[PDB]
Design a protein around this nucleic acid. Structure first.
Ligand SMILES: [K+]
Ligand SMILES: [K+]
Ligand SMILES: [K+]
Ligand SMILES: [K+]
Ligand SMILES: [Mg+2]
Ligand SMILES: [Mg+2]
Ligand SMILES: [Mg+2]
Ligand SMILES: [Mg+2]
Ligand SMILES: [Mg+2]
Ligand SMILES: [Mg+2]
Ligand SMILES: [Mg+2]
Ligand SMILES: [Mg+2]
Ligand SMILES: [Mg+2]
Ligand SMILES: [Mg+2]
Ligand SMILES: [Mg+2]
Ligand SMILES: [Mg+2]
Ligand SMILES: [Mg+2]
Ligand SMILES: [Mg+2]
Ligand SMILES: [Mg+2]
Ligand SMILES: [Mg+2]
Ligand SMILES: [Mg+2]
Ligand SMILES: [Mg+2]
Ligand SMILES: [Mg+2]
Ligand SMILES: [Mg+2]
Ligand SMILES: [Mg+2]
Ligand SMILES: [Mg+2]
Ligand SMILES: [Mg+2]
Ligand SMILES: [Mg+2]
Ligand SMILES: [Mg+2]
Ligand SMILES: [Mg+2]
Ligand SMILES: [Mg+2]
Ligand SMILES: [Mg+2]
Ligand SMILES: [Mg+2]
Ligand SMILES: [Mg+2]
Ligand SMILES: [Mg+2]
Ligand SMILES: [Mg+2]
Ligand SMILES: [Mg+2]
Ligand SMILES: [Mg+2]
Ligand SMILES: [Mg+2]
Ligand SMILES: [Mg+2]
Ligand SMILES: [Mg+2]
Ligand SMILES: [Mg+2]
Ligand SMILES: [Mg+2]
Ligand SMILES: [Mg+2]
Ligand SMILES: [Mg+2]
Ligand SMILES: [Mg+2]
Ligand SMILES: [Mg+2]
Ligand SMILES: [Mg+2]
Ligand SMILES: [Mg+2]
Ligand SMILES: [Mg+2]
Ligand SMILES: [Mg+2]
Ligand SMILES: [Mg+2]
Ligand SMILES: [Mg+2]
Ligand SMILES: [Mg+2]
Ligand SMILES: [Mg+2]
Ligand SMILES: [Mg+2]
Ligand SMILES: [Mg+2]
Ligand SMILES: [Mg+2]
Ligand SMILES: [Mg+2]
Ligand SMILES: [Mg+2]
Lengths: 73, 119, 155
RNA sequence: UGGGAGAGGGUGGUGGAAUUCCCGGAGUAGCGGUGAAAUGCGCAGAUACCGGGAGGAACGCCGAUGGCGAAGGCAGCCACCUGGUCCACCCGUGACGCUGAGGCGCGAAAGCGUGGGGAGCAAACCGGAUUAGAUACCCGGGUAGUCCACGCCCUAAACGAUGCGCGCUAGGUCUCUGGGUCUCCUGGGGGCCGAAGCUAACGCGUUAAGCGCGCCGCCUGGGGAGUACGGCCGCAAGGCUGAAACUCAAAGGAAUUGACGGGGGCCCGCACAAGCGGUGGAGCAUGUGGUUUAAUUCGAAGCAACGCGAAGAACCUUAC
């Protein structure tokens, strides 16, 4: 379905190029380090493309994760 | 024999076998079982029942060491994963939690032909 | 039975115990449609049980049946080249069919010269927990589970 | 002039996931693998688990139905060096344009040379299975190679199998990227459906396979043959160019109706399954094959021939 709410609508005015604001950036990763798909991020082709760049940058810095463990099953 | 109480239960599920390993709070194994450890010798090892049994063998042998509560960690995606989990839960050991930690490369080594044809 | 689901046909209650389960057993005993001879045999049996036992034969009959019913059995199923004995539950309907069939088969395996004695003694050894019938029931259930490894092939 | 998007190219750095190996810990009898197995690995302690290290190769999610490039091709992240291209303004030059034989450069993979590097994978190859055999498919190993640097090679289903440029000829819809007075107009790309029209159909249809002009390349029935000879190129492997004798009546494209599939979806039948009783076993009866015979009359031959024509062979019938 993909209708819990788009991470964009759930936020406020934020700079997509700020690779340090882990506070919000983190809200774009799944229940795993995985970058969420546009169907979930609510972003656009261009916005979504910049997020990726930013996130990956934060991951290199140590602020964001590359992968996490699923907690269930 | 050493008395540990709480620890970890590692389920290594695969299409050919299920092998369970119980360890102390920080990874060192206490006991282990597997479709081979118990009766089953070939094809049967993969089957979920074998998993069930191995899972039980693991817990039982672990309670001897004074185990009581476990933290499960599942690796693998074999025909018998989910059974070992239900096995440990009814084993007596308390399942504090379950976590899937199956390793996945971010695209590293060329897979065996058997695992290719994958675009 | 590719279309409907062939519904179980009802039998006319016993002309004595007025039991459908009895007519059934009588039918299995019956051979070449000699339903009279079949009837007599079963009855002299209820009588022989009255003898050696101070209990109503109808109650013995039941009990016996009950002990010979298999609550599990293996069924063959081809998957990946070979055939695998898949254990699975046994519908009530088939348990009854199996129990009665075996009783007569086991009974006719017996050594006593007279038919009535055979059913009688088999019926007794049955409600007791012994007898060739109950073995079949047990050899079957032992067969099931002995292959519980394949129980996931539910069928 | 002012801006924009981009896995476009080159160089140097750097990150985390995983595999393999090595070191330590803990732990014990199997692991692995298959349709099932075995070869193989493991008490010199493997597998599974934790910690540390080494090294090579690739870059999960984001990824699309997306983007970029002349093509081949191009996916972590960062910096530098650099190509193409789109839009707005309407500012400068003043036809300076198009195409393009030959030339020159680029050109996936494999392959070659010299020197490196090798985690994983894997032609050959060594084994285990399967099989009628199995120089295969499946399994355990494994060298070249796959990676880097320099040179070579120059081929492909190098494909949109559609040469480049320009002008003209409804629209709808989705999408990427600019600009706008940001219902929605505009420009440049990527898809789908379609006006007119075109096409042997299939289909194409402002991203033409439409209507036109310009220039290049190429075809002229199949086999022989991309072969032979010659020339050029190459270290080689081979590449480019490219015949003939002889021979065939076809070779082909698209579409149609069927039949077929170890293709798919629905669905039937004593088809299977569930049952109950039987037949291949005995003796005998009867039909048949085969032998035999002067003749053993003839026909019937999987199902759908075989107690069948024969619902009556001692002579008759019967044709022998
Ligand atoms: K062994
Ligand atoms: K047409
Ligand atoms: K030549
Ligand atoms: K065709
Ligand atoms: Mg196995
Ligand atoms: Mg780039
Ligand atoms: Mg590593
Ligand atoms: Mg070690
Ligand atoms: Mg080895
Ligand atoms: Mg050994
Ligand atoms: Mg050995
Ligand atoms: Mg030893
Ligand atoms: Mg380790
Ligand atoms: Mg090394
Ligand atoms: Mg393009
Ligand atoms: Mg391509
Ligand atoms: Mg540029
Ligand atoms: Mg002007
Ligand atoms: Mg002027
Ligand atoms: Mg030109
Ligand atoms: Mg010119
Ligand atoms: Mg090349
Ligand atoms: Mg190469
Ligand atoms: Mg080389
Ligand atoms: Mg070399
Ligand atoms: Mg290999
Ligand atoms: Mg064969
Ligand atoms: Mg062989
Ligand atoms: Mg191999
Ligand atoms: Mg193509
Ligand atoms: Mg369009
Ligand atoms: Mg367009
Ligand atoms: Mg457009
Ligand atoms: Mg038309
Ligand atoms: Mg046509
Ligand atoms: Mg037509
Ligand atoms: Mg169209
Ligand atoms: Mg045109
Ligand atoms: Mg055309
Ligand atoms: Mg041209
Ligand atoms: Mg030519
Ligand atoms: Mg010719
Ligand atoms: Mg030719
Ligand atoms: Mg050639
Ligand atoms: Mg030369
Ligand atoms: Mg030469
Ligand atoms: Mg060649
Ligand atoms: Mg000719
Ligand atoms: Mg046609
Ligand atoms: Mg056809
Ligand atoms: Mg068909
Ligand atoms: Mg029917
Ligand atoms: Mg019928
Ligand atoms: Mg049947
Ligand atoms: Mg016979
Ligand atoms: Mg003879
Ligand atoms: Mg004739
Ligand atoms: Mg004849
Ligand atoms: Mg007949
Ligand atoms: Mg005669």
């Amino acid at each position: 379905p993909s209708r819990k709410a788009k991470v964009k609508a759930t936020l406020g005015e934020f700079d997509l190029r700020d690779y340090r604001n882990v506070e919000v950036l983190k809200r774009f990763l799944s229940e795993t380090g995985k970058i969420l798909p546009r169907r979930r991020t609510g972003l656009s082709g261009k916005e979504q493309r910049i997020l990726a760049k930013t996130i990956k940058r934060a991951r290199i810095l140590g602020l964001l994760p590359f992968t996490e463990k699923l907690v269930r099953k | 024999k050493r008395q540990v109480a709480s620890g970890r239960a590692y389920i290594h599920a695969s299409y050919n076998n299920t092998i369970v390993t119980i360890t102390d709070p920080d990874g060192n194994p206490i006991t282990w079982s597997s479709g081979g450890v118990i009766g089953y010798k070939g094809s049967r090892k993969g089957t979920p029942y074998a998993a069930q049994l191995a899972a039980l063998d693991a817990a039982k042998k672990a309670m001897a060491y004074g185990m009581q509560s476990v933290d499960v960690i599942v690796r693998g995606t074999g025909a018998g994963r989910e059974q070992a989990i239900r096995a440990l839960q009814a084993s007596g050991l308390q399942v504090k939690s379950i976590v899937d930690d199956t390793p996945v490369p971010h695209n590293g080594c060329r897979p065996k032909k058997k695992f290719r044809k994958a675009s | 039975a590719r279309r409907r689901r062939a519904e179980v046909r009802q039998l006319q209650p016993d002309l004595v115990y007025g039991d459908v389960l009895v007519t059934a057993f009588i039918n299995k005993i019956m051979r070449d449609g000699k339903k009279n001879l079949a009837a007599r045999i079963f009855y002299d049996a209820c009588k022989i049980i009255q003898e050696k036992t101070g209990q109503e034969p109808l109650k013995v009959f039941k009990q016996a049946v009950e002990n010979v019913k298999p609550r599990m059995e293996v069924r063959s199923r081809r998957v990946g080249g070979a055939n695998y004995q898949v254990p699975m539950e046994v519908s009530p309907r088939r348990q009854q069919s199996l129990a009665l069939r075996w009783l007569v088969q086991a009974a006719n395996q017996r050594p006593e010269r007279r038919a009535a004695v055979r059913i009688a003694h088999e019926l007794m050894d049955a409600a007791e927990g012994k007898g060739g019938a109950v073995k079949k029931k047990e050899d079957v259930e032992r067969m099931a589970e002995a292959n519980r490894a394949y129980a996931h092939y539910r069928w």
